[PDB]
Structures are given as structure tokens and as C-alpha cells.
Design a protein around this ligand. Structure first.
Ligand SMILES: CCOC(=O)CNC(=O)[C@H](C)c1cc(C)ccn1
Length: 130
């Protein structure tokens, strides 16, 4: 129905706004673009499903997300990819892991404050009807 298409359009507006607020934070610069094959040719042999915030905006606009739960699966993949690729005790690995961690926790805290639970449940019930 047109009412259901207005629901998904409001979801996309909400997801674009959260993603922009993450992408401008200086801590999260390393998560804003795909890893460069040249600089790191090993990355795509270890990490089987790369993800970054530029790819997330493109996915919003392609109508890939019909719920906030499916958006958060991609934010969780950004933060699990960085934990798995950079697991060592040295300062450079520890700095990306504390930050990858800060990106996950910040996304979940904005959603807990600003997403209405009944809006999410509506999106879930429209998705489950299709
Ligand atoms: C203060 C530096 O930042 C942190 O310690 C943030 N948390 C992590 O790195 C978690 C515990 C972790 C560690 C490892 C070895 C593998 C997967 N996750």
C-alpha cells in the first residue's frame, strides 16, 4: 500500500541521518571507505564480506534495508571485520579495535534514544507479509 511505501521512506530518511552522524566523527574515518586492494592485498583473502559506511549509504538508496535490525547487521559486520583483521597486542591494532567498538556502541545508543519501538515493529510486520 502507499502507506507502507511512506513507512519505508521514513526508515530510509532515519538511516541516512544516523549514518551521516557516524561518518563525520573523526574516530571513524578508517570505516568510511572500502579498504584499498593496492595498499592491503591480503585484506580480501582474510575478510570474506568487506563493509564500510559509504557502502551502507549506497545500500540504503538501493532499498536493501526494510528494518533497523537489517541495517544493524551491516554496522555489526564493519566492527567484527576490524576486530578479526587487527587482533594483536600492538598499539596500532588496539587503537582500531577500541574505535571499531566505539562505532558499534555509538550506533546502538543513537538507535536506542531516537528509534520508536512501534515504528520498528511496523517495518518488521510489513517485511514478514511480503
Ligand atoms: C583499550 C583497547 O580497546 C579494546 O580493548 C576494545 N575491546 C577489544 O578489543 C575486545 C575485548 C576484543 C579483543 C580481542 C583480542 C578480540 C576481539 N575483541
Amino acid at each position: 500500500s502507499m502507506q507502507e511505501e511512506d513507512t519505508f521512506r521514513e526508515l530510509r530518511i532515519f538511516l541516512r541521518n544516523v549514518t551521516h552522524r557516524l561518518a563525520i566523527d573523526k574516530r571513524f574515518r578508517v570505516f568510511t571507505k572500502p579498504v584499498d586492494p593496492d595498499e592491503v592485498p591480503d585484506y580480501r583473502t582474510v575478510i570474506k564480506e568487506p563493509m564500510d559506511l559509504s557502502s551502507v549509504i549506497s545500500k540504503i538508496d538501493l532499498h536493501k534495508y526494510l528494518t533497523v535490525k537489517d541495517y544493524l547487521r551491516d554496522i555489526d559486520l564493519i566492527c567484527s571485520n576490524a576486530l578479526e583483521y587487527n587482533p594483536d597486542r600492538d598499539p596500532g591494532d588496539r587503537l582500531i579495535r577500541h574505535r571499531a567498538c566505539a562505532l558499534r556502541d555509538t550506533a546502538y545508543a543513537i538507535i536506542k534514544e531516537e528509534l520508536d519501538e512501534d515504528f520498528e515493529q511496523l517495518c518488521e510486520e510489513i517485511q514478514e507479509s511480503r
